């Protein structure tokens, strides 16, 4: 288990070093998204929270295909302003209900260090 804390101000930096194996070590859910919302990375914790088989979700669109319940102004819309601005750092509660028991979560979005990618982090509440 990689020692990283959910909400950590420096988190994009710590994660810059992690391969997919190491990402599967975190205490929370981790997704890396492209500017278009396609899934670059996806860890074992998020699988665990949502049910989804990670390896299979890589390459799909988060907002169109996989998580259409986030296709809202409170979630997706927040995302696309952030890609449009080149800056994004937001944290909110949210309920995940697509083809699953409704699961209340806490979500943090942050823009990556690397060029044009974006992190979605997830934990139970």
Question: How many angstroms from the chain centroid is the CA of residue 104?
Answer: 15
Is residue 75 within 8 A of residue 109, CB to CB? The reply is: no
Whole-angstrom Cα distance, residue 98 to residue 110? 23
Give the Å distances, CA to CA, from 24 to 7, 54, 59, 107.
18, 10, 17, 18
* Resolution value, angstrom units: 1.6
Set out the domains of the chain in order of their start, with CATH numbers: 1-125 (3.30.450.20)
Longest dimension (CA), the chain: 36
- C-alpha 43: how far from its chain's center? 9
Contact 42, 121 (CB under 8 A): no
Please give the method by which this entry was determined: X-ray
């Amino acid at each position: 288990m990689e020692h990283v804390a959910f909400g950590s101000e420096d988190i994009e930096n710590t994660l810059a070093k992690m391969d997919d194996g190491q990402l599967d070590g975190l205490a929370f859910g981790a997704i890396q998204l492209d500017g278009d919302g396609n899934i670059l990375q996806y860890n074992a914790a998020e699988g665990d929270i949502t049910g989804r088989d990670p390896k299979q979700v890589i390459g799909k669109n988060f907002f169109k295909d996989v998580a259409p319940c986030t296709d809202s102004p409170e979630f997706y819309g927040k995302f696309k302003e952030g890609v449009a601005s080149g800056n994004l750092n937001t944290m909110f509660e949210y309920t995940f209900d697509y083809q699953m028991t409704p699961t209340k979560v806490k979500v943090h979005m942050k823009k990556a260090l690397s060029g044009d990618s974006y992190w979605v982090f997830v934990k139970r509440v």
